[PDB]
Amino acid sequence: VDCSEYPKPACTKEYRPLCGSDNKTYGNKCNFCNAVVESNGTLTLSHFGKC
Amino acid sequence: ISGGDAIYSSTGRCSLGFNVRSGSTYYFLTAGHCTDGATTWWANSARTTVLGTTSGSSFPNNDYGIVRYTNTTIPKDGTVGGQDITSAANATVGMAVTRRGSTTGTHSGSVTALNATVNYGGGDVVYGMIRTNVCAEPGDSGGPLYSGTRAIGLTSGGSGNCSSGGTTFFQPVTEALSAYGVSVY
């Protein structure tokens, strides 16, 4: 997962979970990458799938 | 199975839009971005109950897809959860609407604009969308947007979440019904 193209103003809402370094399961890549941007690059990917 | 219930592809989970039919052939509508590259659909995460196979998909530009039921025994309710759907209608600014999805359940709000352009990036731009102040979260894609007993649209995407509030864009269902020559029931 590469978030360099973010942020994006909108995301589609399919469910394909990713687990963030904050222990939160992000619903999809777009949601995860937008949160990475919002954290000013502090949030990272833990693993693919649910936390 | 009814509008708003979970549907699983090989890639992920979305929500069933509306059950529709043509002659004696039953299908269900969902988001195009969910049907894109999907062949078979199941009713559960275990992939043990087959629903059907993708018959059409339109995304980006539009955001709708249709799946032909192949499961003969499964009930195909013409409802959204328990709510009966009897017709389809065009969205209007200020219209009170309700969305049901497999992750967040049922949430309500209003239509705040029409013919909106949504850029999902990488060339995935969709046009003519209904904008609302209803929230939606991953898994809710394809779920129905309705108003009373009227079918209005299919969940495409947006931003925010249900806790803080958000903005969600929907594909007008009329366009999809017309494209596939099907109707709600």
Curated annotation (Swiss-Prot), chain A:
Q: State a GO cellular component annotated for this protein.
A: extracellular region
Q: Does the keyword Disulfide bond apply?
A: yes
Q: Which residue positions carry a glycan here? A: N40
What GO molecular function terms would the record report? molecular function inhibitor activity; serine-type endopeptidase inhibitor activity
**In its keyword annotation, does this UniProt entry include DNA repair?**
no
Main location, first listed in the record: secreted
Q: Which domain of life is it from?
A: Eukaryota
Where does the Kazal-like domain start and stop, copy by copy? 1-51
Site feature Reactive bond 3 for chymotrypsin, elastase, proteases A and B, and subtilisin, where: K13, E14
Q: Where in the cell is it found?
A: Secreted
Disulfide connectivity for this sequence is C3-C33, C11-C30, C19-C51
Provide the alphabetized UniProt keywords: Disulfide bond, Glycoprotein, Protease inhibitor, Repeat, Secreted, Serine protease inhibitor
Q: What is known of its domains?
A: Avian ovomucoid consists of three homologous, tandem Kazal family inhibitory domains.
State the name under which the record lists this protein: Ovomucoid
Q: Which species is the source of this protein?
A: Meleagris gallopavo (Wild turkey)
Q: What fragment of the full-length protein is this? A: 135 to 185 of 185
Swiss-Prot record, chain B:
Instruction: Note the coiled coil stretches, chain numbering.
Output: none
Q: Which GO terms describe its biological process?
A: proteolysis
The entry's cellular-component GO terms read: extracellular region
* Key words of the record: Disulfide bond, Hydrolase, Protease, Serine protease, Signal, Zymogen
Catalytic activity as recorded in UniProt: Hydrolysis of proteins with trypsin-like specificity
Q: List the disulfide bonds.
A: C14-C34, C135-C162
Please name the GO terms that the record assigns under molecular function: serine-type endopeptidase activity
Reading the lineage from the top rank, the first entry is Bacteria
What family, per the record?
Belongs to the peptidase S1 family.
Function text? Has a primary specificity for large aliphatic or aromatic amino acids.
Return the protein name.
Streptogrisin-B
